[model samples]
Target chain A: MTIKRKKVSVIGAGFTGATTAFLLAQKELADVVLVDIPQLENPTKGKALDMLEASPVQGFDANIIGTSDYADTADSDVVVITAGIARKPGMSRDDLVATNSKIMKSITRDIAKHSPNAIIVVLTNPVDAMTYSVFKEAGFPKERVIGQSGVLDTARFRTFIAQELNLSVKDITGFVLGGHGDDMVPLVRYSYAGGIPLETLIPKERLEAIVERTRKGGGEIVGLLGNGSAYYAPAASLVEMTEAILKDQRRVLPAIAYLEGEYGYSDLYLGVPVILGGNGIEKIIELELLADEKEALDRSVESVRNVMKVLV
Target chain B: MTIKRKKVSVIGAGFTGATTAFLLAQKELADVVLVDIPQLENPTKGKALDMLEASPVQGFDANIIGTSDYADTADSDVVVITAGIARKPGMSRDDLVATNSKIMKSITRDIAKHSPNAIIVVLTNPVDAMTYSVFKEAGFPKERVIGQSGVLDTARFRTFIAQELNLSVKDITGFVLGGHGDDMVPLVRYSYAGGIPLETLIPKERLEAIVERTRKGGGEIVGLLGNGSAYYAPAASLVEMTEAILKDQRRVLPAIAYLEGEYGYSDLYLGVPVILGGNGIEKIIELELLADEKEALDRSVESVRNVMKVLV
Candidate 1:
């Protein structure tokens, strides 16, 4: 077989989407098509052009393009959705989620039409519900519809723990479950710093403090920026999932997935550890949760259900 | 014998320097210190904090900090200077080169005081002479002081050729000598696509056109962006050089090096093929240049000498 470059399309050309497109091309993982609404087309093209010029210097050939037309996104191997609004001061949570759900439905139609076999990763806020909505609308197999939160959550947690221990973040492994951000159920007992359990390496209260910081990680960044929310990690998280699937790495990473009675949940999309490979999400890793852990997860699923209620 | 995190300080917080810092952190190649002037202290810190927040999401352990203090840059293994001014409107070429020469002299003092043993890579324009200024001011060995041009110059060449051949950029290799951008001397005969020489694949005129475009590659991006010169590729090019040096990769890449009778040059800095590794420019590679190639390089050397003449 001849070597053929895979194609990836990002629906939304905001900071996160554009960064995701650049990272994909930077790694030469796939040719990237960045899609945004027609109103934002020019800026999108500008962003894509800047990144395209970067390819040669970075030593990759993956084509990077911008478009408002779904026709330009044909035959994508992977599609990443990083659009949708955060709940604002005047906006109701239901309305925010509902707006994103409508956008999700609208774009999934284009993705399904243009790249029917594409594995879709969702990163819009209220991601669990949004992922579930994409799964329902795109009619893709559960395996092909994934959501991203855990990878980023664990990343934040690992970073804090690494700083606390004065060690490399690469050696620190943090585990997260249940949901994204506030509802995130961090599995500290299962987490390790250089193969040594963090519980032993770090005292309880300080470690607890680190976990709280990790939960508010998104807020901290937003507050500091005085405007934009975090995109660097969020985009990187999307890239990692895309890379695993593209290269068939079978990487054990956390993702938001459609649950069919796994973890005692059904008709729900929540964060959990899984084997991510070429076959999309290959296997969901079921870990034995403590009674408290299960109870915490129930609260996360409850939040997801609340967001899901916004979907009509 | 033990694993130690390498430290790299980028002596500028402009787009190129900031992106270079982010790329370094993204790869977990080093703990990056992004240094800027006192006036830019806050902005630089903000850039670094933004990148620091990203490390969690990107799965890197590098410590990224921005400072106006060279004390923060102490003991860096590699320090890259991307700070320089382009010849602005009404600015004479000699004055433009002279201003950067002064800046180099001032900053290299700090780099010498802080990271005296550090390998330095210069990216400021009028690079060949600017690099010479650093070598003189910092008094580091020629090997520890390098300039970047040919890597980026050839990268543009390879990119144009790859697009012309409708092939992946990874499969293409390009060679160049002389200087950066307009003064670049591209050796298309040494260039290849998938190990097949370009002369066999593309016609001479088209290949010549690509060479001309490669020479003006930086200007083309600035033309498109309407503001700001190209940073993504330039930053990436700096990153590639940094990675090779930090990893002790000993990669055979082109660099602007101080010549000691190599290729018929004496005590001059010009772009040449070299072994770039942990020891910086470990070896200068001398190719049997065609008579025409020698003539072109001679012209480049003259240009560099003219800039060096501007040196105080």
Candidate 2:
């Protein structure tokens, strides 16, 4: 009897975008539209057709569309931009920042005109800076433009921590903060396992090494895959973030979002904790960091600012 | 790359069982086997074919099968028992308990012999009583046997709460405890919307009326459908529980489970707060309750025990 169906649009049908669409559709969180260039092969059409045929058996009445026009994106609850070149195995996020910025600019132009009400979620490489690129191009409020980065990195961090401790993944809870790249900061002090202090399980040096690996987790996965960046967990994590927002879960999660002077820096995007629910980006919680953590965050902001300057 | 995959066996291909299979397969949680009498319509084959076709589009690689042989369920991670006659409109759960107890007993015996390591999730109504029935029949530890009651009941209660409050459904968190039948207890004190207290939003009388209606919510839907009861949400709730357990999410969910000396009660099966993780009912947490809530739970257990005695 309830008819307020939540709709999400993924603007790109490549590995990351399609996988994000697939996870979101599987979760039945939103009606999805996978939009790409009209001249290109209609990957969205095939994928959308595949999922739409699943409605009766899947048991959720989510309408999915594959389209070439941005007009189809009208009033979307969330617009995820994963439209960019896939990074080759050895490529760094910095190498793709400028090119991805151009693609994002084109997408944001169309999005700002057509789906201005939507919350734009950027999944492009050099995420922290590219998020700022979308912000400038789209001209939307800061809260409405978010860049997805840390959730996947955090998943890897949590997974590595749990594996190291020979513990179940559910018990491990940690976050990788700051920039989304190799220079990102992983706050080891804040880690917990089932409300039990994680510090009790491992020595400080070991935990610090794990945090360093977490900061460079993406490169490791790239080395393993030997073709493209990871999509399964990355896309799945993005979908989780989308669901948390669409469902208004108010899950305190870290994302590369615009900071209105939150970490003693303004006008530059960074990953921070915030409450996500029906009303996109409910609150940006400023963390009370210790002296060392504060210094790490400052250095992290400088790195992101360097990329932001180039991309902008 | 992660090689772990979740597997589930659903005993019986009746409405509940088939729907459960459909939802699990849709989620691509794992490979699923839907076992039913060979005489019954080829629901296993038909449903499997229908669901698998959805995979190319649904994007989940769930291997689904329908079979009459118990051997097909070997090594299943979880076995869900939904093979019982469903109650018609105005019919008390007692009318179906006797027949379902036998049905569940036979199924549990097969699961015990076939998938000895599998966690058994019983969805048969008078579900609280049936959890006790299946536990004794299967001879599994208390941690391995769980019942699908409070989750589905909570879904109904929450949907109603969202509807009444004109709030988004995902924002409302409503939970039902004690039982899955007319005597079930609704825990209004624990409910919330966007982390705001529910007591502050609605009047005491109205909230109590909602609680009373929640106890009878299934009947209301069944009466409307006239031919069959609700399946989509029930299957969804059950699938969510399975995911939480299979993924070792350690989500605090209410489920009908066997209890020994918890909540000042011994040797009784009741719906209570349980931590569901990879090993199924990983642990049960006793919630601090008011005197009246404890009394209501005791009364609820008595109601279920009456059915248990008759079914036994």
Candidate 3:
């Protein structure tokens, strides 16, 4: 009759935050806490209660609470920070870094103070830099604090690839390296559909268009919605990262990582393929990139560094 | 490399339909088609595409498509009907039956034409009567046409019991019989937490209060939202039923069943405990109800028959 129920704290109650809580409970993965500012606390509470009511219908029970107090999030196994300003139509990614960097610092302090052992997953805008900010503030090991850029970027990339081929997305396995969003560097050569190289399946011209669409996937949704950015795909991305860690699924996924001489870079956070398990990132998988892929990666690394510079 | 991918078609792309589609893909239980009216076809497509984009992130690949055409839903293993008018404030459940019966008839005919072998799980309002209408319209076997009510009602009952006892819902097993919503009869004697009878864990007075609250659970959410009714939990309930059938998990669940002689009811759809597997409602599990429970069930059966007469 004993069942181990893990606790996860999500530091935002907006779409991504609340949706993640809903999905977490729906999956029966863990008890969830959704925390937001005092102004937004009521809505957060409303969302939490609504989702709680959903549990009876969904057939999973996890205590889902919404609050503004950090005490509500004590001893969490995993803390996901999606608190920060969202990008508007004309807003530059760099413009989001300074504001969200401060948000991440405060959120990181709150989480680390309450849950020192908790692994941090940062989903703020300019995620690479915000992840770095949380990593520095939380003072966890490099592997414990990661960003949620690569998985979402790769998801868009894979979806576009699958769309092009009119095949099932399940058979497609791929990754995007370096910075996220517009500056994302898709490792096309390392990508495959059913173990067959994507290069062999797709014509070069069509593949390039798909790659460009992947880079602008976030922007495209923002354009369509005419307001906020996406949460469905982003929250879905966060769920996988959390499940991999909590269940120790040992799924190899692409996420932002602090590199120390890996991929010819050091002391920088960038998207790369890594194995996630019970102890957060278990291992970083290295892929030998071709000349153009390496160049694209270098540019992405530079874009991330530029964002990081604004924080300092 | 060979994997059997099952197809599930969801009629109506409203909150319940789309959320069920999302949960289905998230679980990787089966590929899904989110079908709706022509007016909602584009939005359904948008929802399906958004969920598809999330697939690569969530690490599951169940092809999700949204369309108005029945041709797209061919050869589905299971079809869920969640299309109907919701109860507005001051509106009776019977009030919804007339409108929803027409909707269910059309939708059921569409499903029957496209996917004749599919198991039908009905989720329209006044679900028992709606299930009856679909069963007649589709002309499927008794086992294949079932209403989605008792599982959801039981989910609410189990959740409340868990909350009151401060126990994990996973360790609690329970059942709710009779009609959905206000007519639900919670079988407290057969319900247990950690294998201990709930009546022993909770006093009669307190348990009765909880049971009363469970009956009003849907109304509570509607009052709170001040607009729409529930979708999150309804969708979740639908997923378990679909999964039980598609995966042949053979789970014993509380669902709306068409009884020949089970529980002293015949040729009437009412909520009861049953074994659900690949062949749909595999077997109905009859329990000896206490005197009061029997009385409550009889009243519920009368209420359903009254509604069914209105349809006639």
lDDT of 3 by residue, B87-206 (tens): 555777677888889767777888999898999998887888888888888878999999888777777777778788888777777678887665788777888988999888899999
Find the number of clashing residue pairs for candidate 3: 0
- Candidate 1 displacement at residue B246 in angstroms: 3.9
Alpha carbon lDDT of residue B84, candidate 2? 82
TM-score of chain B of each: 0.97, 0.94, 0.96
Model 1 chain B poorest ten-residue lDDT run:
B86-95
Instruction: Tell me, by lDDT, which candidate is best.
Output: 1
For all predicted structures, in order, the TM-scores are 0.85, 0.59, 0.84
Model 2 segments more than 4 A misplaced: A1-312, B1-5, B41-44, B57-59, B164-168, B202-206
Which tens-of-lDDT digit does each residue in A153-198 have in candidate 1? 8877887787788877678888999775667999999899778999
- Enumerate clash totals for all models, in the order shown: 0, 2, 0
Error of 3 at B37 (Å): 2.6
RMSD of 1: 4.0
Measured against the true chain A, the candidates' chain A TM-scores are 0.97, 0.93, 0.96
lDDT of 2 by residue, B29-68 (tens): 8888988887764756887778778878867778888888
Residue A241 alpha-carbon offset, candidate 3, angstroms: 2.7
**Clashing pairs in model 1?**
none
Against the reference, the lDDT scores of all candidates come to 0.84, 0.78, 0.83
